[PDB]
Amino acid sequence: PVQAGTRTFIKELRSRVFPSADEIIIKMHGSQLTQRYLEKHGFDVPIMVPKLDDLGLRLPSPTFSVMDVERYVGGDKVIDVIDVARQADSKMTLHNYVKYFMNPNRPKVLNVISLEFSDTKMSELVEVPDIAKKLSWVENYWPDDSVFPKPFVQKYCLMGVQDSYTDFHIDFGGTSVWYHVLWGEKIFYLIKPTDENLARYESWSSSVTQSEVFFGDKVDKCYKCVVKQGHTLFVPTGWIHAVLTSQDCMAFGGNFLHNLNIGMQLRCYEMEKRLKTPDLFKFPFFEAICWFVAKNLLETLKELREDGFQPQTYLVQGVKALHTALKLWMKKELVSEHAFEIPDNVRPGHLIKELSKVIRAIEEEN
Ligand SMILES: O=C(O)CNC(=O)C(=O)O
Ligand code: NI
Numbered sequence: 600p601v602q603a604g605t606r607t608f609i610k611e612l613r614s615r616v617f618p619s620a621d622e623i624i625i626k627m628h629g630s631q632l633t634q635r636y637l638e639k640h641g642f643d644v645p646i647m648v649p650k651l652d653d654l655g656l657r658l659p660s661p662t663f664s665v666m667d668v669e670r671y672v673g674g675d676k677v678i679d680v681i682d683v684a685r686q687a688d689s690k691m692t693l694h695n696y697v698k699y700f701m702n703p704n705r706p707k708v709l710n711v712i713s714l715e716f717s718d719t720k721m722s723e724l725v726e727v728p729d730i731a732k733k734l735s736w737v738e739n740y741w742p743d744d745s746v747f748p749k750p751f752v753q754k755y756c757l758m759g760v761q762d763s764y765t766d767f768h769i770d771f772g773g774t775s776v777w778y779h780v781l782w783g784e785k786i787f788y789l790i791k792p793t794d795e796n797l798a799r800y801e802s803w804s805s806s807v808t809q810s811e812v813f814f815g816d817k818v819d820k821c822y823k824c825v826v827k828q829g830h831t832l833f834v835p836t837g838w839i840h841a842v843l844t845s846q847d848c849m850a851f852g853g854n855f856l857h858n859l860n861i862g863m864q865l866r867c868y869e870m871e872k873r874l875k876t877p878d879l880f881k882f883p884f885f886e887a888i889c890w891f892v893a894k895n896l897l898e899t900l901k902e903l904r905e906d907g908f909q910p911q912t913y914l915v916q917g918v919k920a921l922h923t924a925l926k927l928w929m930k931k932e933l934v935s936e937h938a939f940e941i942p943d944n945v946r947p948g949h950l951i952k953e954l955s956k957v958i959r960a961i962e963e964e965n
């Protein structure tokens with residue numbers, strides 16, 4: 600029984616044979632990565648942007664140390680730290696981690712992956728990729744007057760010691776994510792969200808042997824993507840991945856939902872509920888933003904229909920799927936747990952109806 604995170608587990612991982620991520624990912628320049636481009640070719644595979652040129656991505660120089668983070672964030676903040684060899688969550692002060700990080704004699708491999716600093720002084724030092732901000736649901740549809748607290752999952756600071764490892768998972772709410780390495784190196788292990796892979800993943804996630812079974816072996820292809828310093832990786836909706844901090848590293852990233860793969864996003868959300876995921880508490884109002892998106896997407900469809908235009912295939916697919924989700928959450932036998940998530944400014948039953956006829960119409964007049 601070789602368990603995840605251990606020294607033995609890392610020896611194998613570091614010497615295994617993985618098809619190169621180069622087989623599925625698209626490398627491009629910051630300027631080519633546009634909303635327009637993605638609406639044409641879609642966002643179905645990871646995108647690597649080697650140079651931060653034209654991304655709109657701004658951040659401290661490659662010399663920003665873990666020490667500078669203690670200053671700008673406040674060594675007092677209690678952050679979640681992972682005990683890699685045990686694959687268990689812990690809690691430390693940002694001050695203690697930095698003490699532990701800069702200490703040559705590291706007794707345990709500890710990793711920090713959830714430090715969201717948008718509500719801190721260091722926030723001013725980072726501007727996220729324009730494409731993320733452009734596609735982001737929170738950026739485009741979150742009201743300035745909701746009772747719900749706006750979700751802040753756009754700026755995370757990642758720090759890890761060599762050999763820290765994160766097992767296979769799907770980001771909360773099936774969010775896409777942008778990831779930039781400041782210094783050091785991270786190695787991603789990517790798995791395509793095919794119907795077969797999702798099934799196995801959920802099964803692997805609910806099996807007791809999960810920690811002793813490398814999920815990479817359970818699928819046809821597990822791609823290795825090395826993210827070196829200065830590079831920016833963009834992972835799309837539903838992608839199953841694991842990460843290995845190959846060397847002391849500091850990176851930045853953020854998650855975001857969008858209209859390109861709503862179906863997949865909803866699928867992942869439903870799965871996270873079936874598994875009871877602790878990460879799904881970062882996007883606690885996923886259902887709320889979904890109601891907001893449904894209202895905007897309805898307006899757009901109304902506009903195209905009343906003028907004789909046909910919506911792009913993906914938009915109809917996404918709305919059709921969003922309709923199914925909303926209708927599900929409204930079921931008498933389930934609404935008791937979804938009711939509070941419905942926005943004050945929306946009429947649930949009516950919105951779902953308008954959605955049904957606008958979709959039916961598109962189905963008929965086509
Ligand atoms: O820790 C890492 O290197 C990568 N982490 C993640 O992808 C995550 O937390 O969702
Ligand atoms: Ni992740």
Ligand code: NI
Nearest residue numbers: 736737855856
């Ligand atoms: Ni978003």
